[PDB]
Amino acid sequence: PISKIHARSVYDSRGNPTVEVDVVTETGLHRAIVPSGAQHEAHELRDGDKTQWGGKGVLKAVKNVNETIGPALIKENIDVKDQSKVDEFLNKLDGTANKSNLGANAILGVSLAVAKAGAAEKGVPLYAHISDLAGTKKPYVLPVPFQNVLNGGSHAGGRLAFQEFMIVPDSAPSFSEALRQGAEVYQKLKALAKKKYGQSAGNVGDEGGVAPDIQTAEEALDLITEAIEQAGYTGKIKIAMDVASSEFYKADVKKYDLDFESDPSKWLTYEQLADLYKSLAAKYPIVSIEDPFAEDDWEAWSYFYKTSDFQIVGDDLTVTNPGRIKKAIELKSCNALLLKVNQIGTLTESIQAAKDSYADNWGVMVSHRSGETEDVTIADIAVGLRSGQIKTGAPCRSERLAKLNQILRIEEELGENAVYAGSKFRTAVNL
Amino acid sequence: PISKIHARSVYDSRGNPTVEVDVVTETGLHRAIVPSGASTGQHEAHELRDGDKTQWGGKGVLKAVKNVNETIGPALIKENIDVKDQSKVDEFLNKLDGTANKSNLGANAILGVSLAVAKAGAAEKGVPLYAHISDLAGTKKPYVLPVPFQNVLNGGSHAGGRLAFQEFMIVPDSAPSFSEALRQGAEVYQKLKALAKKKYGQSAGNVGDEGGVAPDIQTAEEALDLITEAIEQAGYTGKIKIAMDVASSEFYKADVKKYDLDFKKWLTYEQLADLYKSLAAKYPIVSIEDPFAEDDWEAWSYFYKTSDFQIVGDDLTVTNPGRIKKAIELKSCNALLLKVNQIGTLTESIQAAKDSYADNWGVMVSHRSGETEDVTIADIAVGLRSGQIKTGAPCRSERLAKLNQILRIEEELGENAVYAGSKFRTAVNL
Numbered sequence A: 001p002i003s004k005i006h007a008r009s010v011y012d013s014r015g016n017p018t019v020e021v022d023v024v025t026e027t028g029l030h031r032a033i034v035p036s037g038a039q040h041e042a043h044e045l046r047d048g049d050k051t052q053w054g055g056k057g058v059l060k061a062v063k064n065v066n067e068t069i070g071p072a073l074i075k076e077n078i079d080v081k082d083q084s085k086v087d088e089f090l091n092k093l094d095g096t097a098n099k100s101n102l103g104a105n106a107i108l109g110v111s112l113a114v115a116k117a118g119a120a121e122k123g124v125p126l127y128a129h130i131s132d133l134a135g136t137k138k139p140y141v142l143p144v145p146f147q148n149v150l151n152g153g154s155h156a157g158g159r160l161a162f163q164e165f166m167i168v169p170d171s172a173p174s175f176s177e178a179l180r181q182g183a184e185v186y187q188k189l190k191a192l193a194k195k196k197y198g199q200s201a202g203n204v205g206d207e208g209g210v211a212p213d214i215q216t217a218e219e220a221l222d223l224i225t226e227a228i229e230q231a232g233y234t235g236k237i238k239i240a241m242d243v244a245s246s247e248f249y250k251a252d253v254k255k256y257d258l259d260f261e262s263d264p265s266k267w268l269t270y271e272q273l274a275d276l277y278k279s280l281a282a283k284y285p286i287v288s289i290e291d292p293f294a295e296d297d298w299e300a301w302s303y304f305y306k307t308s309d310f311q312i313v314g315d316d317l318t319v320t321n322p323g324r325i326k327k328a329i330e331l332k333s334c335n336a337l338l339l340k341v342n343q344i345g346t347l348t349e350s351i352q353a354a355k356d357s358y359a360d361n362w363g364v365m366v367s368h369r370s371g372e373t374e375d376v377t378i379a380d381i382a383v384g385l386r387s388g389q390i391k392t393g394a395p396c397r398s399e400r401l402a403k404l405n406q407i408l409r410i411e412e413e414l415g416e417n418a419v420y421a422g423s424k425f426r427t428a429v430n431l
Numbered sequence B: 001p002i003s004k005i006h007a008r009s010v011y012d013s014r015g016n017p018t019v020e021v022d023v024v025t026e027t028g029l030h031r032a033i034v035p036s037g038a039s040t041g042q043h044e045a046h047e048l049r050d051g052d053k054t055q056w057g058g059k060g061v062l063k064a065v066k067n068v069n070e071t072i073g074p075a076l077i078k079e080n081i082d083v084k085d086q087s088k089v090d091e092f093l094n095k096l097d098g099t100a101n102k103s104n105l106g107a108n109a110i111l112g113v114s115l116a117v118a119k120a121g122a123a124e125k126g127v128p129l130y131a132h133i134s135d136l137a138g139t140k141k142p143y144v145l146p147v148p149f150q151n152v153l154n155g156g157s158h159a160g161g162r163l164a165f166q167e168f169m170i171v172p173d174s175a176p177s178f179s180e181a182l183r184q185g186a187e188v189y190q191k192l193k194a195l196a197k198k199k200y201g202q203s204a205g206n207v208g209d210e211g212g213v214a215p216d217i218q219t220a221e222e223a224l225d226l227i228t229e230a231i232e233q234a235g236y237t238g239k240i241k242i243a244m245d246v247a248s249s250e251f252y253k254a255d256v257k258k259y260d261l262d263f264k265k266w267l268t269y270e271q272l273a274d275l276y277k278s279l280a281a282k283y284p285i286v287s288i289e290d291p292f293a294e295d296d297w298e299a300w301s302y303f304y305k306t307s308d309f310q311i312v313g314d315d316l317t318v319t320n321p322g323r324i325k326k327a328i329e330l331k332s333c334n335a336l337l338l339k340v341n342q343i344g345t346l347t348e349s350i351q352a353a354k355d356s357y358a359d360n361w362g363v364m365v366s367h368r369s370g371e372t373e374d375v376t377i378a379d380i381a382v383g384l385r386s387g388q389i390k391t392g393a394p395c396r397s398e399r400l401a402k403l404n405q406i407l408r409i410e411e412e413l414g415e416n417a418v419y420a421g422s423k424f425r426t427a428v429n430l
Ligand SMILES: O=C(O)[C@@H](CO)OP(=O)(O)O
Pocket: B036, B037, B038, B039, B040, B167, B210, B245, B247, B314, B337, B366, B367, B368, B369, B370
């Protein structure tokens, strides 16, 4: 049984507080940290004291764990291996749809730490425990890393509207080789950004990529193309994009602004914006595009889904919510889910969201948040869900690479009992 | 005894491979990762790299990893040394390498085993690593939590720009606790980053290798004014001090005996000493690291004689007891920057700290510019009773993981620990 549940405040990769939860059983201490992003999302609880951390404190969510959730869960005396019963009891304590009573960050912290307690009691690592929960088959599939190497949009100075530009090393024979290839391409890109845009262009962003003053999407894609050629991996490494188009969708006119100080004549309809995506995908090896249209522009998604053979990933459209996923399935809006566990609040609901996506032959890309920690839970999640896709930043900044290092340890531990997803990442759950 | 010693390759916070070692005993697995520096000194321990320019640009550590798995691992297991006797372990590791600079088997191969065995030794004792280190170092109780020297504005070889000086740090020593000092630094950092964007564009908000903001500024007076304004906006003026790591070995043209403040009109060491004295009388600068070159011993002594603030040796002393002895005898500095991977073992790192304490030096346990999720130096700083740690800005988790670990140590110890505060230069005898 659980002997102690204790939470505390730690700092994330941006320097903001977040929740860390300890769960102690006979097998030892089991610790998890909650991420944080920068929507119909799960309501995370912030203190709001503008004299402490700029109002970003989480003392209230920590207190809810220590004073309310903890003692109630210990008295309930649920088997730590039964994640469904644990998370059901956590949502019963909260009692709200968006987890606004106790806080999504407080609930998830207990949920993930109890999951590691359940894994430790079974004598298996977390990814094996999650595979039992999700019912994924063996051998384990190691995910292809979608490594963000260049950033635009609201996180850059140029007119580039797209947010994230990633490299996809899917042709590598192993996850270990896919990491070295991505690492080498990233070094060639950082040196290119320095030589082409100045020494300051090498300073990284929140996720570890560069963000120089770039004006067009092809200018960013050309720079990535040049970095892949220098490393000698042309044709073996693909490209992914996270447009984050909710940042520049003017809902009043149903038009998209590619310079969100702009002109009113170049504002793209979703038919015009899709033509630019189709043109880029016919020129560059773009195999995955995330959030190409706004979070509530369902008609645009379905229009784009009908003609596209590449992966169409929902993030702000789906917010890891099975209700939004069911609607996206019924309207044929996307074919992949970006899984952010803190967008829904519990591991069980996160697994259910992945299962609902698999039922429509979707891909699942387990993702990080822009504010990450040294916690590596999502590395075991991507392996346990047999997702074949993980998105956890550049090969830079350790809140990003600690996830990749963990998969290296999982890769070495499993050996023959694990296969790399490869080019079959969109269907890895049935690989 | 030891049942398994295994090493693998992992990536550091810059994307370069480094060495991670596992040591398994009856108490379980014990793991440590070796850091890696960018502004390395010439006298540091030899870091073994593969040199295969087709793999990681020649920065692989497959040979250092192999040296642990095929040479060091089997040799230490057969010797059957008590995991608590760190001295005999580190003495045995140096016997296998047999070289002074740890060239042979690789200092990154030796350090990984040394730090992992240390965590295994602590677990057999049933105590945390900082307690086991306090036993090895002979430091008294209660435990002293370190003042976090947070490099909030990066420069030099740590960030792209025109700023010559490497590190500009804030020193929250007036705070009543480590936890409050960490909140103060996080609040000042948020005021600084917003101020850097407003004053120098959104590009100035991007960070360097150690998490600090990198505005494209020229002089150190600009950086100090920016930090000063951020401290005032946060409301902690007079409670937070300022420290600098010049890393002047990076721009010391040794031929003309001059320092290039634009190495990306050079000064002598007298002219550079006048600049330091003018900045220290203008800003609350309480500690300056590497103000002169790693072998410019005359300049260090010339500057030490007239300065009451902390003068920290880094590339001058490279955590080497032989270099520390010279600096003591020549009166070159009054503080040591302790980097474990500069010397190669934990015992030699501890001995370097004790030799500094004998001359009433301060000791600042430091990270490297390329760090990992490893948090060993947090327990090292608390175990050595150093009262001051340098582990980066409150940004990028390879920096904060050490800070988060000290928060857990703070909560674990309660009243059995005290924050070093303003006594960080003399915290060992606090
Ligand atoms: O110079 C230093 O003090 C260290 C830590 O800041 O940097 P590097 O590891 O690059 O030597």
